[PDB]
């Protein structure tokens, strides 16, 4: 059983692989609060998505991509022209090899620092295994 | 089998529950469009998400929170000075225990009261029993 | 198994089914980048989500449903009075029948163009065969 969940809890900015550190679910501890990165343990097929919400009252764009090791798997964005709170968010499926790692990466602007509000977010799940 | 999705068919505001009364998947009828609450039957691992949108028009910001039983799991905002239309969205994944309720809760502000065209929805489904 | 995750490569304006063709998982072959359709195979449940990112610069509302055939099942908008970049985005858990057609259809308005960077995307999966 592989499936996670977890929220910020402090806020970033910048570029910077996110670490989600407010941990709801985390079945076989495949997921590393002190990282922000899911390693892969089985071969197969997995679902993922992601929330991040731009801070409001500073700053007018932010970026949050999900990558694979170094490459971009997808990309948001979140931009308001009046420093309004809004959401960089995306899904994917993607297949993954034993030593893959998954995350967000903070790709420009500011994100919201939730405590334990859970305003900005991570999960995933295995869907099929090789 | 446990899986639901649904729409809002009416509009809402303030500090309530969201009675997603457009119902179009219900698999062992566990969500009830009468209460806007899921309500788990089996010990296990559980996937949801929710887009709502905010009213046009007419307000700025609307939160919009997923809870679990008096609990919020996660949150989200809408928010644009221009009073457009955007969402208050996120997804997480949850340990319940027979008898936990799940549901969103708007936090203030307006929610759009699409018909039956189904622009503000929750969704979700067991991925693992216990 | 039966899973795909696509982006757009191109920009799209107006009404039309969009094209996700930029293919990252795709088991079966059961989405066909050539038409933007998902053409269920197996009766069952299905879980489809989309992430359709609106034009920057250039205009200030844009409408993306998720269609079954010729029915719309999600709606969503994005707007900004300002043009700036935002996302109509929704989930769905639906029942299908084998021939079944599930798509994203512009419904209004301008969708960015990533070229590889899959800011737009479109993915689902199987959860239950009947």
Redesign the interface.
């Known amino acids: 059983?592989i499936?996670?969940?977890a929220?910020l809890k402090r806020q970033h900015e910048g570029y910077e692989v996110l670490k989600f550190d407010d941990v709801?679910?985390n079945?076989g501890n495949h997921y590393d609060p002190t990282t922000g990165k899911f390693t892969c343990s089985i071969p197969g097929?997995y679902?993922f998505?992601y929330?991040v919400?731009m801070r409001?009252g500073d700053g007018?764009?932010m970026w949050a991509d999900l990558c694979k090791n170094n490459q971009?798997?997808?990309?948001?964005?979140?931009?308001?022209?009046?420093q309004?709170?809004?959401?960089a968010?995306?899904?994917?499926?993607?297949?993954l090899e034993p030593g893959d790692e998954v995350y967000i990466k903070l790709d420009g602007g500011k994100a919201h620092g939730?405590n334990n509000?859970?305003?900005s977010?991570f999960?995933?799940?295995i869907?099929?295994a090789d």
Chains 1, 2, 3 share one sequence.
């Open positions: 059983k499936a996670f969940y929220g709801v679910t079945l097929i679902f998505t929330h919400l409001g007018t764009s971009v798997r997808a990309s948001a964005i979140a931009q308001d022209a009046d309004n709170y809004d959401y968010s995306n899904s994917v499926v993607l297949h939730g509000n859970k305003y977010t999960s995933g799940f869907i099929y």
